[PDB]
Amino acid sequence: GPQPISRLEQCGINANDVKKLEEAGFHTVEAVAYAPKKELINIKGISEAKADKILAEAAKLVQITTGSKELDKLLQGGIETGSITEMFGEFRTGKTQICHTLAVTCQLPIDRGGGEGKAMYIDTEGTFRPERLLAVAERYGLSGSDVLDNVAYARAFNTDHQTQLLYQASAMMVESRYALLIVDSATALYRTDYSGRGELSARQMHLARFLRMLLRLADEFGVAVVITNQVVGNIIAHASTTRLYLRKGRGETRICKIYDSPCLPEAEAMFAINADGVGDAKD
DNA sequence: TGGCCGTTTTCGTTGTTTTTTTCTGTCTCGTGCCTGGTGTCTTGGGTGTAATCCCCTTGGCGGTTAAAACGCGGGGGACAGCGCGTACGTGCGTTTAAGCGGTGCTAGAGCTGTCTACGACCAATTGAGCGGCCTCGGCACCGGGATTCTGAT
């Protein structure tokens, strides 16, 4: 399991540097331990000696239904909890709609295709609609009020705030059972904030660390990690376990394709976006 | 398809290198000679060697503290790019004097002879300078106040 980074402070790292590591997004001794010097050195106010002391002392201690049956079959029954699933597609393909649907379906009983856990929606694009969550809840006969009470929401204004919310998510996810973490327009802040060309490596490093934190949180809490990508990077490939390509069919009916999964076939399924739901295509 | 730029080549030229031919003076060999280098014998003093001593260099112990090492923020200086203008490179017509060859001449370089002033050397002398001892004041260090100076405002 995890080894929360608090224990690293008893090794004699000072607590301020541990706070800087938590701000960076390292929350376990496992997390600090299996990384090279440069990760800790790149943090502001950390020299090579402090990074070597951290690594040295760290080595001492150490299926959610989509609600579309065709899509569930495409996924062999739904998202695997504990792993990151990326859905990349054009704008208006229904990524946000799928997120809203899953934010409620996660709360469904496991026998009903849920995870019996609360949902987490981190929004960067303003598209969060509690009324859509209410619609999905009424679709499955779930209490809309309890759905909104079991979904904690916060809009990230920048990449630093986007990573900082993970610090609150890790501590908050310990007290209550969650099953779904949603990050909508996850890549948008890396394009709007970091727009220059010399700063590309900085946003790539921040994204890499963010993805590693996502995988860490997935393995730590056994929750589903959902991130949304606008396709107007090869780094996500090794990190994402299931890549879904979304494209528009005219009207409100969307085509979904699987474009990489080591376990799931590359395959396609047709679905629609209905007021209640993300739901099977009904010609 | 039109334009622009990179390139390649090609032709002109021209300055540099290479090949050939005449000469010449500069270099290689021969000769005669004489003086500087070699053999011999001599002395003596300079250098090699041996014993001794002591002083002064090396090594160690300990402390302690000033300086070295290290981290970090930042600012200012190194450096790259760009535009311009002017000073400098190139070429050409003119001229000036550098160079070469001849002729003249005389100051002074160079050699020789002579000799006298002067310096090596030596003995006796003695007083200046050196080794050693002692002391006091210029300077250095401490401390404290005054003044100056720098940078942010």
From Swiss-Prot:
Residues 146-219 are annotated as: Interaction with PALB2. Gene3D superfamilies: 5' to 3' exonuclease, C-terminal subdomain, P-loop containing nucleotide triphosphate hydrolases. GO terms for cellular component: centrosome; chromatin; chromosome, telomeric region; condensed chromosome; condensed nuclear chromosome; cytoplasm; cytosol; lateral element. GO terms for biological process: cellular response to camptothecin; cellular response to cisplatin; cellular response to gamma radiation; cellular response to hydroxyurea; cellular response to ionizing radiation; chromosome organization involved in meiotic cell cycle; DNA damage response; DNA recombinase assembly. PROSITE patterns: RECA_2, RECA_3. Highly expressed in testis and thymus, followed by small intestine, placenta, colon, pancreas and ovary. Weakly expressed in breast. The keyword Nucleotide-binding applies. Pfam families: HHH_5, Rad51. Ubiquitinated by the SCF(FBH1) E3 ubiquitin ligase complex, regulating RAD51 subcellular location and preventing its association with DNA. Ubiquitinated by RFWD3 in response to DNA damage: ubiquitination leads to degradation by the proteasome, promoting homologous recombination. Phosphorylation of Thr-253 by CHEK1 may enhance association with chromatin at sites of DNA damage and promote DNA repair by homologous recombination. Phosphorylation by ABL1 inhibits function. There is a cross-link at K38, K44 (Glycyl lysine isopeptide (Lys-Gly) (interchain with G-Cter in ubiquitin)). SMART domains: AAA. GO terms for molecular function: ATP binding; ATP hydrolysis activity; ATP-dependent activity, acting on DNA; ATP-dependent DNA damage sensor activity; chromatin binding; DNA polymerase binding; DNA strand exchange activity; double-stranded DNA binding. It is found in: Nucleus; Cytoplasm; Cytoplasm, Perinuclear region; Mitochondrion matrix. The modification Phosphothreonine is found at T253. ATP binds at G89, E90, F91, R92, T93, G94, K95, T96. Keywords: Acetylation, ATP-binding, Chromosome, Cytoplasm, Cytoskeleton, Disease variant, DNA damage, DNA recombination, DNA repair, DNA-binding, Fanconi anemia, Isopeptide bond, Mitochondrion, Nucleotide-binding, Nucleus, Phosphoprotein, Ubl conjugation. A motif (Nuclear export signal) lies at residues 207-222. The nuclear localization may reside in the C-terminus (between 259 and 339 AA). It is linked to Breast cancer: A common malignancy originating from breast epithelial tissue. Breast neoplasms can be distinguished by their histologic pattern. Invasive ductal carcinoma is by far the most common type. Breast cancer is etiologically and genetically heterogeneous. Important genetic factors have been indicated by familial occurrence and bilateral involvement. Mutations at more than one locus can be involved in different families or even in the same case. Mirror movements 2: A disorder characterized by contralateral involuntary movements that mirror voluntary ones. While mirror movements are occasionally found in young children, persistence beyond the age of 10 is abnormal. Mirror movements occur more commonly in the upper extremities. This is DNA repair protein RAD51 homolog 1.
